[PDB]
Ligand binder design. Structure first.
Ligand SMILES: COc1cc2c(cc1Oc1ccc(C(=O)O)c(F)c1)[C@@](C)(CC(=O)Nc1nccs1)NCC2
Lengths: 92, 481
């Protein structure tokens, strides 16, 4: 049921960095456990990952620096609502 | 002596809020803003590939609150850096910035908050969801429509339904267009505001000034207006503030020849202005357009009103005229406006009239009937008819009463509003466009065509527009007693 999204404007995409968005009522403790579970599952497959930030206050989830190869795995993690590849914003 | 843009937002009769800015670094010592801007210097910027670095943010803090060239002179501001020296940021950095604002509020609650987001990226599900969460928490978000001469619905945060999205106009009330760049437009734009040749604080020196252009400058004018409207009336919900910004704007001053043909009608022809006074009850309505249904032979379009607004009418439109009308239907204890496409496509729009009516409304429906056509009425005493809708299944063809074609279902929006007086104004001519307008002081609640082939109908401010390939435009006009 979890889906993946990337920016439609190809030069603005930032592959390698993803915002993992969890289901509405996910507690911060669960977001941290899901980020650690991703890191351990990735390590067992030979992938290095970096949890840059854990979100709470607006939306539950986290920001992860990792190879896109791990996306099918990350989409299977518990509480995952969707995953978005990072993208650029500009002064207007 | 007065910058043109400050005169432009001054209305024809005239006499506690914090503004958060998510932009580049700023020159907090500038005389325009010194002592009134708190630099949090929360930093989340991508690597670059000081007067140049702080140019954008310093000019915008000046547009909002500058002592001499600001909209809301002396307003308190807080700035967060999310854009690098070249004005580039990330969606993730923007999310962290928005989250930091929410955390700051939880730790030290203050009064109403206006968040100015003078930036844009491509449509982002996560950035729009974060704007939604922050608005649901009670914060007002004002965003730049974008400078890409494109539909603002394709950019974020511009496309987030819960924000106020602002387009840019010049001294001639024309959309700003500078080369390959120019203001964004479309149904996701709430209104326009001065966005060309805007004088403001220059970070080159503490007393220096520079003229800049963009939807960022346009959005800073609306953030300044919103901060002042919220200071005078701090209980305003977001829906009440958006309705007031629309109501107090200069109407039909933008030449829409500049926009692509299909975008002209969808784009609000509004230039922001301050209200004539700081502060009985009046009827506020606005038009909400859905996204296009698609090409599908069975395609439908859905238009809904923002939280704490009432849907008073529903119309539909198709450039080809190949449609099966529309219907008002209850969903999650709220009325929605659903429009149906027909065989030959290419799709349709559902157009709702969304009003502030704190009154009990309902839908009265009659299925197809008979030479007398299909009819339904608000039978109950003290009830006002606010809108008529009609839909048909078949591929091809009195006061408080709606009339439809014999092969079509008819829907009536019926409201128990004792403080409201309503009249139905009709205008029929034997023509590609027929219009009928409510008189001054009256608010258009409903717009429809009398049941030869019409493309559709839509309300433009307080004018009902009926487009055809006689033909009668029918307007329902209401006012507070
Ligand atoms: C993606 O669509 C839109 C983006 C923006 C805007 C309007 C949009 O149109 C919509 C939005 C939502 C629905 C729905 O069904 O919930 C709908 F039918 C139409 C406005 C003009 C603000 C506004 O009106 N927001 C609303 N919220 C609720 C109703 S209107 N500026 C910001 C971006």
């Amino acid at each position: 049921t979890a889906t993946f999204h990337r920016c439609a404007k190809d030069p603005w995409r930032l592959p390698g960095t993803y915002v993992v968005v969890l289901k509405e009522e996910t507690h911060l403790s669960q977001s941290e456990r899901t980020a650690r579970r991703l890191q351990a599952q990735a390590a067992r497959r030979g992938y290095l990952t970096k949890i840059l930030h854990v979100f709470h206050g607006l939306l539950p989830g986290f920001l992860v620096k990792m190879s896109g190869d791990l996306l099918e795995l990350a989409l299977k993690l518990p509480h995952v609502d969707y995953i978005e590849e990072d993208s650029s914003v500009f002064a207007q």
